[PDB]
């Protein structure tokens, strides 16, 4: 616990932004996966 290097926070607005970005990334991956199942 005395090692200094082992010890080498986020606000709320950026938390909302991160959650929204996670949402759009999920939607994009969903549509990308749907695109590979289309009929040929």
């Amino acid at each position: 616990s005395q090692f200094l290097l082992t010890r080498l926070k986020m606000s709320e607005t950026e938390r909302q932004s991160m959650e929204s970005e996670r949402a759009d990334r999920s939607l994009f991956v969903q549509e990308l996966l749907l695109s590979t199942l289309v009929r040929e």
């Binding site: 959650e19 929204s20 996670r22 994009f28 991956v29 199942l37």
Partner: protein, 390 residues
């Protein structure tokens, strides 16, 4: 991080390059990892922000996908196409937001869509794909793979998440229904897939929509084919299988689930009585290749038969007609199934309807075919009882 797209491209390339290999070592060491990566990306952790403590994931997106098109295109995306990137895709979607207002919105959306279609048709704008899912893919391969169960579970989670807006859910349900015939080939390995399917149709209107598309005859045909295979196997060999009757049990349970609600029970009873009656008789014929699952299937089939045989006079006449129809095909040497048919008829006693349908000559030939008394006492007793009834 900000380079997430390149990592996702690497993962998806590895997934699609190694998704069609049947070897268990590849499924366990490559496909499962890519499936877990995709599952983590599709289903993000629950939000912790104070405002968004209650709302789900679908309520957080800043854009709204179109109902009947797919704008993301994986074939160009995997080749590093600048016109098919993530920002390019997100730029093509609209931001999340009286009678005349509704009308104006309708025609504006419709003719703007037509304008864009013409612009893509003649000019240089990219044309979105159509939401029509193929029936042969990697999805059926992954959903029923016997190499490892975790891959099946991850695929089930992915396909469950792929069906959120009803426009996609309709196609997803259609594909899963098409996958119904895999139950017999992959008996216990389908345990996950079934658990997904029943969850996706847990609402009444989806069951009714599937019924309108002609799924009840499909399940009936599958059940009859499985019962015929069971009879053929019972006739020939004497092997023991610890999984016998799983697929038949699952299909019968699914049919009972489709029937429990009122509308399809009332509508589709005239077309399903013959199948259920024939299946019940054939299952009752089993004497050696009989297990607990077959016993439960027979019990449920009997309960279904009891439930459907309750209605008006026209349906009773139709049921009698189909009962005589199934009595016709049975040969003159067996003395078990006709006894059941005729005691059922006498219990439901109706007495003159078979005069109209012409079932009298059937029972006349049944009397004429009796050449022995020791082995035909029950048939004679029931036939004489119904003759006195008639």
């Amino acid at each position: 991080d900000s380079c997430w797209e390149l990592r996702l491209r690497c993962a998806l390339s590895l997934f699609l390059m190694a998704v069609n290999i049947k070897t268990p070592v590849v499924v366990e060491n490559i496909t499962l990892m890519c499936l877990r990566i995709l599952q983590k990306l599709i289903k993000p952790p629950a939000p912790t922000s104070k405002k968004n403590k209650d709302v789900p994931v679908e309520a957080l997106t800043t854009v709204k996908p179109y109902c009947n098109e797919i704008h993301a295109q994986a074939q160009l995306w995997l080749k590093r196409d600048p016109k098919a990137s993530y920002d390019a895709w997100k730029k093509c979607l609209p931001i999340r937001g009286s009678k005349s207002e509704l009308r104006h919105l309708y025609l504006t959306e419709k003719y703007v869509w037509r304008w864009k279609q013409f612009l893509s048709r003649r000019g240089k704008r990219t044309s979105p794909l159509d939401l029509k899912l193929g029936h042969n893919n990697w999805l059926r391969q992954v959903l029923f793979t016997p190499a490892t169960q975790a891959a099946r579970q991850a695929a089930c989670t992915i396909v469950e998440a792929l069906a959120t807006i009803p426009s996609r859910k309709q196609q997803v349900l259609d594909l899963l229904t098409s996958y119904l015939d895999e139950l017999s080939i992959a008996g216990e390995c389908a345990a996950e897939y079934l658990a997904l399917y029943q969850k996706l149709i847990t609402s009444a209107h989806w069951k009714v929509y599937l019924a309108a598309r002609g799924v009840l005859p499909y399940v009936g045909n599958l059940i009859t084919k499985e019962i015929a295979r069971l009879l053929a196997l019972e006739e020939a060999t004497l092997s023991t299988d610890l999984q016998q009757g799983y697929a038949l049990k699952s299909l019968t349970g699914l049919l009972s689930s489709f029937v429990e609600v009122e509308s399809i029970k009332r509508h589709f009873k005239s077309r399903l009585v013959g199948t259920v009656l024939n299946g019940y008789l054939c299952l009752r014929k089993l004497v050696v290749q009989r297990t607990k699952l077959i016993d439960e299937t027979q019990d449920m089939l009997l309960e279904m038969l009891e439930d459907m045989t309750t209605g008006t006079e026209s349906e009773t006449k139709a049921f009698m007609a189909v009962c005589i129809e199934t009595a016709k095909r049975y040969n003159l040497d067996d003395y078990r199934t006709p006894v059941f048919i005729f005691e059922r008829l006498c219990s439901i006693i109706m007495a003159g309807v078979m005069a109209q349908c012409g079932g009298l000559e059937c029972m006349l030939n049944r009397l004429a075919g009796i050449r022995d008394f020791k082995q035909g006492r029950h048939l004679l007793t029931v036939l004489l009882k119904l003759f006195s009834y008639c």
